[PDB]
Design a protein around this ligand. Sequence first.
Ligand SMILES: Cc1cc2nc3c(=O)[nH]c(=O)nc-3n(C[C@H](O)[C@H](O)[C@H](O)COP(=O)(O)O)c2cc1C
Ligand SMILES: Cc1cc2nc3c(=O)[nH]c(=O)nc-3n(C[C@H](O)[C@H](O)[C@H](O)COP(=O)(O)O)c2cc1C
Ligand SMILES: O=C(O)c1[nH]c(=O)[nH]c(=O)c1CCc1ccc(F)c(F)c1
Ligand SMILES: O=C(O)c1[nH]c(=O)[nH]c(=O)c1CCc1ccc(F)c(F)c1
Lengths: 313, 313
Amino acid sequence: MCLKLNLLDHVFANPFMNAAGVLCSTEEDLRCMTASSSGALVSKSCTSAPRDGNPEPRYMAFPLGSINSMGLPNLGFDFYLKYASDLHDYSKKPLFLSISGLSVEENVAMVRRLAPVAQEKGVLLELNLSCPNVPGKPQVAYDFEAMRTYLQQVSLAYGLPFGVKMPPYFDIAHFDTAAAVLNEFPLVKFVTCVNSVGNGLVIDAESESVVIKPKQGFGGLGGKYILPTALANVNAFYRRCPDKLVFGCGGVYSGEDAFLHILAGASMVQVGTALQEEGPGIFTRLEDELLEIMARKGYRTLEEFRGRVKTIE
Amino acid sequence: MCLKLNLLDHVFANPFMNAAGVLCSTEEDLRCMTASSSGALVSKSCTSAPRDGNPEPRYMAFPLGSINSMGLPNLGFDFYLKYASDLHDYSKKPLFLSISGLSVEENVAMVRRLAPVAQEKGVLLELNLSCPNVPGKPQVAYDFEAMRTYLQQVSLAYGLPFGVKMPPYFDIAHFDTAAAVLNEFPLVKFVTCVNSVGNGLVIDAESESVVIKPKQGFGGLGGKYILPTALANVNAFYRRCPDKLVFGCGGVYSGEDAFLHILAGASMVQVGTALQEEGPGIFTRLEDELLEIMARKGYRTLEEFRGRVKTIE
Ligand SMILES: Cc1cc2nc3c(=O)[nH]c(=O)nc-3n(C[C@H](O)[C@H](O)[C@H](O)COP(=O)(O)O)c2cc1C
Ligand SMILES: Cc1cc2nc3c(=O)[nH]c(=O)nc-3n(C[C@H](O)[C@H](O)[C@H](O)COP(=O)(O)O)c2cc1C
Ligand SMILES: O=C(O)c1[nH]c(=O)[nH]c(=O)c1CCc1ccc(F)c(F)c1
Ligand SMILES: O=C(O)c1[nH]c(=O)[nH]c(=O)c1CCc1ccc(F)c(F)c1
């Protein structure tokens, strides 16, 4: 009947939103997401200062998904904060703001500024743990001590409920260690699984060439390639973090794919590649498709099946 | 025009072989592989003792690839060593023997006994590092200290050229660290990239159930899902290990997929999922298709294009 839900002290029309980085960089983008049928929107991950990002071409898409090395292009934190404090129409849907500083200190400085606006307006923070490569050290969410420092510092500085955008993991021990880090932080109220599958390489057979210019063609994978990885991550953290929400991201092209995310444990479902390729019309199609699968199955609510994926024996 | 290779002091009719675990567990399997048009074969990764593996269903395939948690079912090392010593017809094609002991000591025990057979008959060792060690620790090749220890102990015990089967990596830092570990070992003459993309989760929408029984449905991914990941790892190790060969594995269904692996740096090209699904006739098709692409492009030999992927600007 209707897909409306309540999370994090906000009401949402439906569980769909963009994935950070897609259709969310400019004021134009944000207004378009706000005008869409999505249940929420999230802004492009920002730095304290504006960034141009990497040389083009830096994104390409294919029948099975996408590759990107954007380089964190963004208008800077002051723009996104202004959008949250003065321009967003909260009557339309909730807003999440994604932050991706290049150091702990930069994150801290952004979150301290965000906190009053969060209190006054209700904007929600998604903290992105992924970053450009620094030779000699791993990405922050793949360095569990660094992750723990980031979260300790942001938690102290911010003081309010927030979420974290996670890269995928591929090892059960890693799921156990990551979730145990996150569970140390009561203010981490949602976990978004997943960011792009890192450092894939698409090659064009005719030209014998990589398809993006930065990083010798290496870039993060999204889309169909990554749905089983995304589901695995959603479910692993759903199981491990019973006091948190999990937001699913990765490989959603249809209401059926959303249904699978929700079965695995997702509360919100984010759409990246498929949104980039189809445009914001996609949200009406996803809603219709999800309601049709629910009706066929007899489900009246998302809660009836969230996390209820069945195991064998 | 030809697909011939000469490497590791062996001659190969073409670069294609099975991926370890597919069509290689029983004498019947190995005889089938030998009868096929493949350029080589590898035996099922073995332990000291026979294993039944995990409960079924433990492998499933779909249009975009496969998922498995087999549990290392195998006939034991003594069977594979007998096949290599007594049964295999080396006039037909070269044989690789894959080992996947559950501790460094089990590996050392096997390679000590393999050595004289390697020396006399020419069987080639593939050591599987994308394998469990202590539960609650990451797989061996995700634990760089453990990986170093396995390589030091097996190199001392074996004393002959061998290769290693690697899981995929997703972070530049890990490519750099892993390749640096491998480059400490002069006896590691080939590197096979990649094993399955770990701990994915396939869910069936109609039944609302995972599709394999072990590990609550979590298992390693193969097939179309993983081709960009496999190409990235092939190229990353090809660039970082200039004194070693790289063998490609992951997402090969066509001659074009194989051509992309070879442009990335692959010497041998291994076929898992697609061989599991299509059967050994696949090798004639892959040879025909790769030759057709070479004819269109005017390439007469594999070396004309191996490693020659172009980057932008
Ligand atoms: C062009 C592009 C830019 C992105 N930028 C960001 C970003 O700024 N912050 C972030 O958290 N994830 C970013 N991502 C990752 C996506 O949010 C999402 O995690 C990933 O694309 C997987 O979802 P999908 O399979 O729906 O594409 C970006 C993805 C794309 C394709
Ligand atoms: C049923 C099955 C069993 C496998 N068993 C092994 C194994 O014993 N040893 C190993 O190194 N890799 C094993 N693998 C991984 C494959 O060798 C290969 O690395 C992976 O399937 C990716 O290649 P693909 O995309 O062609 O399937 C197995 C894969 C499958 C599908
Ligand atoms: O802006 C990006 O390149 C980007 N793309 C993603 O798919 N996810 C992200 O989180 C980001 C921003 C952070 C980031 C910036 C540069 C990278 F090389 C990287 F892998 C991640
Ligand atoms: O026999 C297996 O499950 C297997 N499957 C693969 O796709 N690759 C492998 O190397 C193996 C053997 C090692 C292994 C054994 C148990 C696991 F849970 C696991 F992920 C890997």
